[PDB]
């Protein structure tokens, strides 16, 4: 054996064990989700409060790319930031040459090809993050989830991290109960509920909720963080459902 | 035994990394099939969407490389999309440099040459994919050309790829033994698609709904993929006969 | 470019590639340098498992770096050519910019620096060579003898030997060389050098090379007969 | 074990051992403390000597007039990273006539450390940093780990026995956060914090190092007889 | 094998730690700082009696106000000295002044960690950098291949270091004269040296504000050796 | 990274030898024997082809003996492909010297440079050495007739008579026995063929398993001629000395 | 710079080179030696652009001396001249060409013959019985066409050279402050002190 | 990133072997049999077209390739390696010869260039050797007809006739009995077909056999007229029909 | 053709006493026959009790002052907050200016 000691080496199965090992780093991370809605997308993430000394609201994890795309990830946080920095470079050069802001599917493949490139050589390490991201373009709303291997798909709902299975089950109920569609304001509330429900798998430390959204009607197609009254309203909705 | 980790020869003259890349090909558990008509080339592939949370419209292994060339991939999607982007770029450059559309077989050779390099150069791994290129070439007519991680490529009368490829291959062989010709003797592409689905059903022994399949069709001057309703229309026609 | 760090530290603080380069020097043919009151003599062993040699054209063991400085060595022959070439180029470059030939110390310091650079550069192995560098500074009559080694360290010697069985000939020189009274003449210095090689060599035939460097670019290589006379004279005094 | 030869290798449970070993160098380092109010931010550092004949290794470095850090671990790595911060602060001033936000300073350090954890040949930085500053949104304290993780805090501590000071600050949180417009009291709280990490040794005059930045105070370091006030 | 810039599980760089072992094999070098000057002394340690000891150069001038002693793989020091001299002279060219001893030391220590897969390995030599400047007066620095430098009142490096350092711990006080320091270096060198100390196998030097950096003659050191033996017999 | 798969071709053994050079010499010891003999009025080059097949085209073939310029030739022992790389470099080097100085290159200068290239592959670059040993036979107006040999280490030496490749130990003893200084070319031709005939691993030495060449001043007045022997000429010279 | 002459006779090559170094309206020096010894039996004189001349001469000198030490052998005058030509032929298509004209006087010890080569800054080489660079040639070539014989002695060559210097001192516009004369023969290079 | 493999992947073992070259020759041994026979007025090169599937069109896969109008190549071993070698070989005939001398290279020199490319894959950083042996047949004005074998090492040998691959040992012995120095091109084609039948197992016809010749100039294959000195390619690929015609009088 | 230089006019003046020094300059900034600003200062406090003016082409003047101010900042960072003496500042400014010897700062500098 020794097939797992080097990146880009195929095992006799046809697997790249180093990527599968990066997936273990993702599974170890905190829970993050994405909900696609009528005219946009909603992102939410669990922020474990390690200590009282952490300043609330001041260790922001959701990141914006361009002015219309939001990105959140679970796993090695620095790796996620590297991916977003690239995403921003990719989006800037697209807008430079083509004038129009980068479409979400186009942006999804830019990240995909870049992450896939880090599975081609033994001189680089795969990314230790699964990234949920999306936004609104000329063809409406799109939600994506990208994994260490470079694999990504479009999603109605997406989840990753330590509470992914709990969150997935909760996402599937929403898809079944709302075939016509979920509204942006509803999806924000649901996102809060699901992060609280997915927190059961990480319940030693209590946490801080962080939500963002893009909606054609509610945010004018731009990425905005959910703060203040709308955030507290979403927190309360979640608190009522766990009891 | 580091001769199994990089693309150097083993004592018996083999390249294990190339061999293991072939095994990665079936990792998706999807079977694909390509046939030729008089006027067209039809490629079909299974579409398995296990997760209910997936957007089914974004799950695809068929790619539109150029206006005339289509490509279906057997293998993991990251390597599949890697191959697709390169193929698109190569076909675009060819047209700019040489003043005419890149033929299906030339693109196949070029992608096969790139694959060969990864089998010889150490720092680059092979892609765990098998690429099936389809078109109606303006010189050669309906064309199917297929590439693998070894860098091998060849033209086909028809072909199949995937875990249950051998069953589909012999099924097609037996038909062409019977028909005595190199193609499907049919006027419309609609019935060549129907033939493709019919013979996949027989070989695999499974029934398909409109969402269990994925169909690409190449005609003169365009390659296009079918919608769920285009396939449903096609499934109804088979059932009513 | 090939980058690998080949010369690295081991847990005990040794650089094995440098130390193994010293083993290559230990394998090489013996070389000795002895400086007198008014001269330096470089003596060199030549192994006799090679008969049918052509001594006219075969690379000589002692090389002129400039008209006033010479360099002998022990170790890998191919390696030594690279050091000699670089030294000869620096010799001409020094004359060009300073308008004065190199001092023996300076030339030695340069050669040692090259050797050191090959012990902490990526992609290269150290030189399997130690050198004896002898001569006279411009407008100076004081004899100079220096030694370098693969690590890059260099130093001045009244008399020194390198190569195989060099520990035996160093032993001889340590009791037979008086610091208070160095070989007063050319004859005395050549004899002491030949004597020291005869402790290790075998036959004093075509096994010993002797080169004498005197002040003001006065360098000459002795022929077989000239050396053989020293061999003959030493043996007759020995039977006593 | 078999997966700690370099930073480019993941372990089967998804760990980066070279990064973890770099983290270990910080744990061996001498204790340093960081804490802030709404008006000032304060660093306190215990300095370490080789023996009684040697000087005491300096732990605190100035980055700009409004920013600076303290170090625990490999000091040369802190010199590289502090120099990078000095340039980034400087670029912001020369090009935009803008003082670099302490938050951006953190994001920049995160991304510089990260690149050293994903490529062959390199190594992670072997030092932890506590960055304090005062910018357009008031006082700040950051904790830098060479894994890339940067965290904004009211107070913290890194180094050997840092857990004592970190527990103390966690208890004292409600008190020291409201020490506004009083430098000497915020320092006293930090000096009391670092005292919870001492064993057999006590704070002397050439042992203690204190830094402060705030609303009407440039980043300034105190050593020698200037810290005698606080012992 | 393994990367050159690899960390051990205890959080230390293998290659830096191993180079520290090479320095322990080196010949002893001692430095003592006083308010009248800094003294630098070294054990020459000739490998053979035929080697002309005055060609052994382990104490070296960097500038008129800065001197340097070495221990370990001394061939590794040449480029460090070359850099130091250039740094010192370059600063004088750019600023029309003497460069601070600490700034010099920091510049030399910047080279140290510039190895990996830059040079192929760390330096196998430790330096004692002694000098004077107007701001901080007489200073002694110990520069390691780790990139770290400590200021010292007194410091020994090399094979006899841990024994000599313990001796320096007892003997040093803040009122030592230059003459007292000279004798102290000789005394401690004679203790830790293998062969018997004399003017040929040990070398002294000092840096003073007035006369700058000076390596002593063998005649001058011989009299200090004689003065030392007489004083130890005198009680 | 890629460190895992690095053979480290340019390192020392604990004994102070270069692994790859030693192993390349071991490779060369299985190659067909080549002999050079220097006489007072010319030089002989004789080499044995590696086990021949009857369907091999013998006349349009070159394996052992190559021409560097009009005054210098080489006998090869080792990998042919490696040797041709070095031969083309040598050929270019000779033309560079001629272009610079308007004089044909002195033999030793060419030999030194080719040997210096080999040396480089043993000290830096991480590449395998050239698995080749040369016998150089040439003439210039300084030293007249000269024989040299170089090997993968980049070390070269001068000879009156020398062998490379297989059975050098036995071949050298035989040459050392019958060689004398006043020897003529035609005597050297005979010695060369007699030595190969006794050291060969084949049943009997025939024309189709030999390459042969002479460098004489046997042109017309004070000038040197290279003669690469044709198949029929080797057949004749083999009969003339009574080997067949 | 300005005046450099060369005459090849039976057994030697004689080079005469002007002693003046003029910049603007000032003769800065009247004892300048516009020559370098490349090897024991090869001498090169030079004239042209300020700085370029000596820089080139010394660069060639270093290369020939390097060759001598490497091979323990002296290059023939023909070989040295070809090396120098190629350096100038390279130079002329450089970003900044060497503006230097040279004469190379040598004694070939293998042939036992004197040899004189004239090479200009373009790299134009010719072997000649007598040579000159610059405006000097306009007077000396015709003079030497008349008085030169191929079998002359060194003494006859010096008298023939006196005749050239006299003509140049009579008809040339500038004061070139006389010449330094050097002889290249079987015994090497020596300087005539009283000219 | 970037190719960090700047070191040799083929190195000498203690016994003196070059492992990767040996193993490449092993790959050639597994390869399908190909052969070449030199006649007085031409050369024939032949091989079996091993079909991967009956649905595959074996006409689209050419094992025998034109390099220049007067030079052709065939191989045994790894197809993909051969394909790229043909691309490189065709280009080098132009870049390092035709663009300099205005004419095509003689066989021995083109062969020499291919051999160089294969030698470099044996010594350069981060590459394995090519897993093929080539048989190159060609004609040029001053050397006439010639046939060369190029091995993974980069070594090349001129042959009167030879075979490489699967059943080369038996095929070479067969050729030794049949070859003489008076063979006419048609006699060599006949012997080529006989020798190949021994190593072929399944179908033996013009669709399963690939065969080309280097013979007379073909003015009909030139594509233009008007230049007397240009007379057409000597390389010609025999058609499926042309092979079957000769298999009846076998 | 683009001319990268301009002339912003104005004049400056420096006088040194026994225990003081003055550096004066007018505040007018011009191009051609137009006034750009009646109050645009060009004499600056650069720290360490050094005042500096670079008069001529204002874009070069500002660039130089900006670079020297920055040089003072880094001198502190690199040499333990040591004060930059006026003689050392002068030598540093020589190198700033001569660094652009073949594309000069079009200014007369006084400190
Ligand atoms: Cl290609």
From Swiss-Prot, chain C:
Disulphide bridges, residue numbers: none
Alphabetical list of CDD domains matching this protein: proteasome_alpha_type_7
BP GO annotations: proteasomal ubiquitin-independent protein catabolic process; proteasome-mediated ubiquitin-dependent protein catabolic process
InterPro entries, alphabetized: Ntn_hydrolases_N, Proteasome_alpha, Proteasome_alpha-type, Proteasome_asu_N, Proteasome_bsu_CS, Proteasome_sua/b
Coiled-coil intervals: none
Keyword Electron transport annotated: no
Keywords: Cytoplasm, Nucleus, Phosphoprotein, Proteasome
Subcellular location: Cytoplasm; Nucleus
Gene Ontology, cellular component aspect: mitochondrion; nuclear outer membrane-endoplasmic reticulum membrane network; nucleus; proteasome complex; proteasome core complex, alpha-subunit complex; proteasome storage granule
Gene3D superfamilies named in the record: Glutamine Phosphoribosylpyrophosphate, subunit 1, domain 1 (3.60.20.10)
Transmembrane segments: none
Residues found modified as Phosphothreonine: 58
Record flagged with keyword Isomerase: no
SMART domains tied to this protein: Proteasome_A_N (SM00948)
Pfam family, one: Proteasome_A_N
Further comment: Present with 16800 molecules/cell in log phase SD medium.
The protein's assembly and partners: The 26S proteasome consists of a 20S proteasome core and two 19S regulatory subunits. The 20S proteasome core is composed of 28 subunits that are arranged in four stacked rings, resulting in a barrel-shaped structure. The two end rings are each formed by seven alpha subunits, and the two central rings are each formed by seven beta subunits. The catalytic chamber with the active sites is on the inside of the barrel. Interacts with CIC1.
Family: Belongs to the peptidase T1A family.
Protein name: Proteasome subunit alpha type-4
UniProtKB/Swiss-Prot annotation, chain E:
Modified residues (Phosphothreonine): 47
Main location: cytoplasm
An annotated GO cellular component: proteasome complex
Keywords: Cytoplasm, Nucleus, Phosphoprotein, Proteasome
PROSITE patterns: PROTEASOME_ALPHA_1, PROTEASOME_ALPHA_2
Signal peptide interval: none
Location in the cell: Cytoplasm; Nucleus
Protein's UniProt keywords contain Iron-sulfur: no
Pfam families tied to this protein: Proteasome, Proteasome_A_N
Domain of life: Eukaryota
Keyword Cell inner membrane: no
Phenotype upon changing residue 41 to D: In DOA5-1; slight decrease in activity
GO biological process: proteasomal ubiquitin-independent protein catabolic process; proteasome-mediated ubiquitin-dependent protein catabolic process
Chain positions found as Phosphoserine: 48
Role description: The proteasome degrades poly-ubiquitinated proteins in the cytoplasm and in the nucleus. It is essential for the regulated turnover of proteins and for the removal of misfolded proteins. The proteasome is a multicatalytic proteinase complex that is characterized by its ability to cleave peptides with Arg, Phe, Tyr, Leu, and Glu adjacent to the leaving group at neutral or slightly basic pH. It has an ATP-dependent proteolytic activity.
Subunit structure: The 26S proteasome consists of a 20S proteasome core and two 19S regulatory subunits. The 20S proteasome core is composed of 28 subunits that are arranged in four stacked rings, resulting in a barrel-shaped structure. The two end rings are each formed by seven alpha subunits, and the two central rings are each formed by seven beta subunits. The catalytic chamber with the active sites is on the inside of the barrel.
Family to which this protein belongs: Belongs to the peptidase T1A family.
From Swiss-Prot, chain G:
Gene3D superfamilies assigned: Glutamine Phosphoribosylpyrophosphate, subunit 1, domain 1 (3.60.20.10)
GO MF entries: endopeptidase activator activity
CDD domains: proteasome_beta_type_2 (cd03758)
GO cellular component assignments: cytosol; endoplasmic reticulum membrane; nucleus; proteasome complex; proteasome core complex, beta-subunit complex
Major localisation: cytoplasm
A UniProt-annotated Pfam family: Proteasome
Domain of life: Eukaryota
Gene Ontology biological process terms in this record: proteasomal ubiquitin-independent protein catabolic process; proteasome-mediated ubiquitin-dependent protein catabolic process
Modified residues (Phosphoserine): 76
Subcellular location(s) per record: Cytoplasm; Nucleus
Record SUPFAM superfamilies: N-terminal nucleophile aminohydrolases (Ntn hydrolases)
InterPro entries linked to this entry: Ntn_hydrolases_N, Proteasome_beta2, Proteasome_bsu_CS, Proteasome_sua/b, Proteasome_suB-type
The protein's role, per its UniProt record: Non-catalytic component of the proteasome which degrades poly-ubiquitinated proteins in the cytoplasm and in the nucleus. It is essential for the regulated turnover of proteins and for the removal of misfolded proteins. The proteasome is a multicatalytic proteinase complex that is characterized by its ability to cleave peptides with Arg, Phe, Tyr, Leu, and Glu adjacent to the leaving group at neutral or slightly basic pH. It has an ATP-dependent proteolytic activity. This subunit has a chymotrypsin-like activity.
UniProt record similarity statement: Belongs to the peptidase T1B family.
Miscellaneous information on this protein: Present with 21800 molecules/cell in log phase SD medium.
Protein name according to UniProt: Proteasome subunit beta type-4
Curated annotation (Swiss-Prot), chain I:
Transmembrane segments: none
Record's subcellular location: Cytoplasm; Nucleus
Subunit structure: The 26S proteasome consists of a 20S proteasome core and two 19S regulatory subunits. The 20S proteasome core is composed of 28 subunits that are arranged in four stacked rings, resulting in a barrel-shaped structure. The two end rings are each formed by seven alpha subunits, and the two central rings are each formed by seven beta subunits. The catalytic chamber with the active sites is on the inside of the barrel.
Family in the record: Belongs to the peptidase T1B family.
Functional note: Non-catalytic component of the proteasome which degrades poly-ubiquitinated proteins in the cytoplasm and in the nucleus. It is essential for the regulated turnover of proteins and for the removal of misfolded proteins. The proteasome is a multicatalytic proteinase complex that is characterized by its ability to cleave peptides with Arg, Phe, Tyr, Leu, and Glu adjacent to the leaving group at neutral or slightly basic pH. It has an ATP-dependent proteolytic activity.
Protein name in the entry: Proteasome subunit beta type-6
Classification lineage: Eukaryota, Fungi, Dikarya, Ascomycota, Saccharomycotina
């Amino acid at each position: 054996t020794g097939y797992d000691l080097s990146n880009s080496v195929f095992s006799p199965d046809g697997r790249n064990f180093q990527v599968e090992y990066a997936v273990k780093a993702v599974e170890n991370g905190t829970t993050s989700i994405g909900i696609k809605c009528n005219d946009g997308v909603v992102f939410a993430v669990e922020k474990l409060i390690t200590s009282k000394l952490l300043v609330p609201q001041k260790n922001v994890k959701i990141q914006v790319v361009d002015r219309h795309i939001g990105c959140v990830y679970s796993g090695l946080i620095p790796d996620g930031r590297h991916l977003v920095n690239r995403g921003r470079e990719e989006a800037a050069s697209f807008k430079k040459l083509y004038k129009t802001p980068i479409p979400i599917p186009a942006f999804a493949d830019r990240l995909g090809q870049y992450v896939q490139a880090h599975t081609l050589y033994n001189s680089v390490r795969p990314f230790g993050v699964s990234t949920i991201f999306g936004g609104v373009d000329k063809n409406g709303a799109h939600l994506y989830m990208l994994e260490p291997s470079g694999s990504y798909w479009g999603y109605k709902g997406a989840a990753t991290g330590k509470g992914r299975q709990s969150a997935k089950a909760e996402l599937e109920k929403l898809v079944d109960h709302h075939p016509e569609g979920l509204s942006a304001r509803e999806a924000v509330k649901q996102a809060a509920k699901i992060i609280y429900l997915a927190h059961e798998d990480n319940k030693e430390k209590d946490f801080e909720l962080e939500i963002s959204w893009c909606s054609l009607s509610e945010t004018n197609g731009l990425h905005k963080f959910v703060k203040g009254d709308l955030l507290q309203e979403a927190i309360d909705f979640a608190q009522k459902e766990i009891n | 035994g580091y001769d199994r980790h990089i693309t150097i020869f083993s004592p018996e003259g083999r390249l294990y990394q190339v061999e293991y890349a072939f095994k990665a090909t079936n990792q998706t558990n999807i079977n694909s099939l390509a046939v030729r008509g008089k006027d067209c080339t039809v490629v079909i592939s299974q579409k398995k969407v296990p997760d209910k949370l997936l957007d089914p419209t974004t799950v695809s292994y068929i790619f539109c490389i150029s206006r005339t060339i289509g490509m279906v991939v057997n293998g993991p999607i990251p390597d599949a999309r890697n191959a697709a982007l390169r193929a698109k770029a190569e076909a675009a450059e060819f047209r700019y440099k040489y003043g005419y559309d890149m033929p299906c077989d030339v693109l196949a050779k070029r992608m096969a040459n790139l694959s060969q390099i990864y089998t010889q150069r150490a720092y680059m791994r092979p892609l765990g994919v098998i690429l099936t290129f389809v078109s109606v070439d303006e010189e050669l007519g309906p064309s199917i050309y297929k590439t693998d991680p070894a860098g091998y490529y060849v033209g086909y009368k028809a072909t199949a790829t995937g875990p249950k490829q051998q069953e589909i291959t012999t099924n097609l062989e037996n038909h062409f033994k019977k028909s005595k010709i190199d193609h499907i003797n049919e006027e419309s592409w609609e019935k060549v698609v129907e033939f493709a689905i019919t013979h996949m059903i027989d070989a695999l022994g499974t029934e398909f709904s409109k969402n269990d399949l994925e169909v690409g069709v190449a005609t003169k001057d365009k390659f296009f993929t079918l919608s769920a309703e285009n396939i449903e229309e096609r499934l109804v026609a088979i059932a009513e006969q | 470019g090939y980058d690998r760090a080949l010369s690295i530290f081991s847990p005990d603080g040794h650089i094995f590639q440098v130390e193994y380069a010293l083993e290559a020097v230990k394998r090489g043919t013996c070389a000795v340098g002895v400086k007198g009151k008014n001269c330096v003599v470089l003596g060199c062993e030549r192994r006799s498992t090679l008969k049918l040699q052509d001594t006219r054209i075969t690379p000589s063991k002692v090389s002129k770096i400039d008209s006033h400085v010479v360099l002998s060595f022990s170790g890998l022959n191919a390696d030594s050519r690279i050091l000699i070439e670089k030294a000869r180029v620096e010799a001409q470059s020094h004359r060009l910019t300073l308008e004065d030939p190199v001092t023996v110390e300076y030339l030695t310091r340069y050669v040692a620096g090259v050797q050191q650079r090959y012990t902490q550069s990526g992609g290269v192995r150290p030189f399997g060579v130690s050198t004896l560098i002898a001569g006279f500074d411009p407008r100076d009559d004081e004899p100079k003898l220096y030694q370098t080694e693969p690590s890059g360290i260099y130093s001045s010697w009244s008399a020194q030997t390198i190569g195989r069985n060099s520990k035996t000939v160093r032993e001889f020189l340590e009791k037979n060389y008086d610091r208070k009274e160095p070989p007063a003449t050319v004859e005395e210095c050549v004899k002491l050098t030949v004597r020291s090689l005869l402790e290790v060599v075998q036959t004093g035939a075509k096994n010993i090379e002797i080169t004498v460097v005197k002040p003001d670019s006065d360098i000459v290589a002795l022929s077989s007969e000239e050396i053989n006379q020293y061999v003959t004279q030493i043996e007759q005094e020995k039977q006593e | 074990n078999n997966y700690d030869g370099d930073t480019v290798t993941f372990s089967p449970t998804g760990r980066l051992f070279q990064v973890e070993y770099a983290l270990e160098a910080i744990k061996q380092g001498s204790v340093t403390v960081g804490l802030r109010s709404n008006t000032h931010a304060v660093l306190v550092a215990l300095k370490r000597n080789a023996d009684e004949l040697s000087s005491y290794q300096k732990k605190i470095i100035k980055c700009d007039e409004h920013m600076g850090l303290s170090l625990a671990g490999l000091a040369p790595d802190a010199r590289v990273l502090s120099n990078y911060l000095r340039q980034q602060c400087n670029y912001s001033s020369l090009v935009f006539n803008r003082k670099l936000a302490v938050e951006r300073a953190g994001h920049l350090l995160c991304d510089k450390a990260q690149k050293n954890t994903q490529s062959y040949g390199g190594r992670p930085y072997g030092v932890g940093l506590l960055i304090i500053g005062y910018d357009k949104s008031g006082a700040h304290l950051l904790e830098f780990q060479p894994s890339g993780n940067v965290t904004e805090l009211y107070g913290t501590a890194i180094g050997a026995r840092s857990q004592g000071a970190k527990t103390y600050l966690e208890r004292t949180l409600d008190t020291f956060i409201k020490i506004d417009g009083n430098p000497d009291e915020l320092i006293k709280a930090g000096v009391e914090a670092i005292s919870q990490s001492l064993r057999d040794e006590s704070l002397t005059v050439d042992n203690l190092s204190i830094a402060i930045v705030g609303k009407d105070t440039p980043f300034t370091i105190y050593d020698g007889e200037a810290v005698a006030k606080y012992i | 094998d393994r990367g050159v810039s690899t960390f051990s599980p205890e959080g230390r760089l293998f290659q830096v730690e191993y180079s520290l072992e090479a320095i322990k094999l080196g010949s002893t070098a001692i430095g003592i700082a006083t308010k009248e000057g800094v003294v630098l002394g070294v054990e020459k340690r000739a490998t053979s009696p035929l080697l002309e000891s005055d060609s052994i150069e382990k104490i070296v001038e960097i500038d008129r106000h800065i001197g340097c002693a070495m221990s370990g793989l001394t061939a590794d020091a040449r480029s460090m000295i070359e850099h130091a001299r250039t740094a010192a002279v370059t600063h004088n060219l750019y600023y029309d002044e003497d460069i601070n001893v600490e700034s010099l030391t920091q510049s030399v220590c910047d080279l140290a960690l510039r190895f990996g897969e830059l040079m192929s390995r760390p330096f196998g030599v430790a330096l004692l950098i002694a000098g004077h400047d107007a701001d901080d007066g007489y200073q002694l620095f110990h520069a390691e291949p780790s990139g770290t430098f400590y200021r010292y009142n007194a410091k020994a490096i090399g094979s006899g270091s841990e024994g000599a350092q313990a001796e320096l711990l007892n003997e040093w006080h803040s009122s030592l004269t230059l003459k007292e320091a000279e004798l102290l270096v000789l005394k401690i060198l004679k203790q830790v040296m293998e062969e018997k100390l004399d003017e040929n196998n040990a070398q002294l030097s000092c840096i003073t504000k007035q006369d700058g950096f000076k390596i002593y003659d063998n005649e001058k050191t011989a009299e200090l050796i004689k003065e030392l033996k007489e004083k130890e017999a005198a009680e | 990274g890629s460190r895992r798969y690095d053979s480290r071709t340019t390192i020392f053994s604990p004994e102070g030898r270069l692994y790859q050079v030693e192993y390349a010499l071991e490779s060369i010891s299985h190659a067909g024997t080549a002999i050079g003999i220097m006489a007072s009025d010319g030089i002989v080059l004789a080499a044995e082809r590696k086990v021949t097949s009857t369907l091999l085209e013998q006349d349009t073939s070159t394996e052992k003996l190559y021409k560097l310029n009009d005054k210098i030739a080489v006998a090869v022992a080792g990998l042919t492909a490696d040797a041709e790389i070095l031969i083309n470099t040598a050929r270019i080097h000779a033309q560079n010297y001629l272009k610079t100085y308007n004089e044909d290159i002195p033999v030793e200068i060419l030999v030194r440079r080719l040997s210096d290239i080999k040396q480089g592959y043993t000290q830096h670059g991480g590449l395998r050495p050239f698995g080749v040993s040369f016998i150089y036979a040439g003439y210039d107006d300084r030293y007249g007739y000269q024989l040299y040999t170089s090997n993968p280490s980049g070390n070269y030496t001068g000879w009156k008579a020398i062998s490379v490749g297989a059975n050098t130990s036995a071949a050298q003893t035989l040459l050392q026995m019958d060689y004398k200084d006043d020897m003529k070319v035609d005597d050297a031709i005979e010695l060369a063929l007699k030595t190969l005939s006794k050291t060969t691993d084949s049943s009997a030495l025939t024309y189709d398993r030999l390459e042969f060449a002479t460098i004489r001043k046997g042109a017309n007045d004070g000038e040197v001629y290279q003669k690469i022997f044709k198949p029929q000429e080797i057949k004749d010279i083999l009969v003339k000395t009574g080997i067949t | 710079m300005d005046i450099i002459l060369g005459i090849r006779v039976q057994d030697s090559v004689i080079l005469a080179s002007s002693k003046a170094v003029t910049r603007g309206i000032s003769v800065l020096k009247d004892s300048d030696d516009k020559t370098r010894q490349l090897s024991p039996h090869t001498l090169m004189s030079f004239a042209g652009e300020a700085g370029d001349t000596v820089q080139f001469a010394e660069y060639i000198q270093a290369n020939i001396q390097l060759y001598s030490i490497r091979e323990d052998y002296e290059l023939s005058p023909q070989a040295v001249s070809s090396f120098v030509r190629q350096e100038l032929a390279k130079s002329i298509r450089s970003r900044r060409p060497y503006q230097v004209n040279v004469l190379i006087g040598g004694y070939d010890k293998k042939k036992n013959k004197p040899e004189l080569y004239q090479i200009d800054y373009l790299g134009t080489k010719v072997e000649l019985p007598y040579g000159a660079h610059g405006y000097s040639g306009f007077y000396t070539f015709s003079l030497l066409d008349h008085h030169y014989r191929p079998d002359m002695t060194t003494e006859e060559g010096l008298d023939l050279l006196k005749l050239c210097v006299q003509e140049l001192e009579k008809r040339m516009p500038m004061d070139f402050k006389g010449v330094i004369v050097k002889i290249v023969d079987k015994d090497g290079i020596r300087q005539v002190d009283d000219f | 990133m970037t190719d960090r493999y700047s070191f040799s992947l083929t190195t000498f073992s203690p016994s003196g072997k070059l492992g990767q070259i040996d193993y490449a020759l092993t790959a050639v041994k597994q390869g399908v049999t190909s052969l070449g026979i030199k006649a007085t007025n031409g050369v024939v090169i032949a091989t079996e077209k091993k079909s991967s599937s009956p649905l595959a069109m074996s006409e689209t896969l050419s094992k025998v390739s034109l390099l220049t109008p007067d030079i052709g190549a065939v191989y045994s071993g790894m197809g993909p390696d051969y394909r790229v070698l043909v691309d490189k070989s065709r280009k080098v005939a132009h870049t390092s010869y035709k663009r300099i001398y205005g004419e095509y290279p003689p066989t021995k020199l083109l062969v020499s260039e291919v051999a160089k490319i294969m030698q470099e894959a044996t010594q350069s950083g981060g590459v394995r050797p090519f897993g093929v042996s080539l048989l190159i047949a060609g004609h040029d004005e001053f050397n006439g007809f010639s046939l060369y074998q190029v091995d993974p090492s980069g070594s090349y040998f001129p042959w009167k006739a030879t075979a490489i691959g699967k059943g080369s040992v038996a095929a070479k012995t067969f050729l030794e009995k049949r070859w003489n120095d008076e063979l006419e091109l048609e006699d060599a084609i006949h012997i080529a077909l006989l020798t190949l039948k021994e190593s072929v197992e399944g179908e033996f016809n013009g669709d399963t056999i690939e065969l080309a010749i280097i013979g007379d100039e073909n003015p009909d294959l030139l594509g233009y007229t008007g230049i007397p000195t240009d007379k057409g390619p000597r390389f010609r690929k025999l058609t499926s029909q042309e092979i079957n015609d000769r298999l009846e009088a076998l | 053709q683009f001319n990268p230089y301009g002339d912003n006019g104005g004049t400056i003046l420096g006088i040194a006493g026994e225990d003081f020094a003055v550096l004066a300059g007018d505040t007018r900034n011009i191009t051609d026959y137009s006034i750009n600003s009646r109050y645009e200062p060009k004499v600056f406090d650069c720290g360490d009790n050094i005042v500096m003016s670079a008069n001529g082409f204002a874009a070069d003047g500002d660039a130089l002052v900006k670079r020297f101010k920055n040089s003072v900042k880094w001198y502190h960072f690199d040499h333990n907050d040591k004060k930059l003496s006026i003689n050392s500042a002068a030598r540093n400014i020589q190198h700033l200016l001569y660094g652009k010897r073949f594309f000069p700062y079009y200014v007369h500098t006084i400190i």
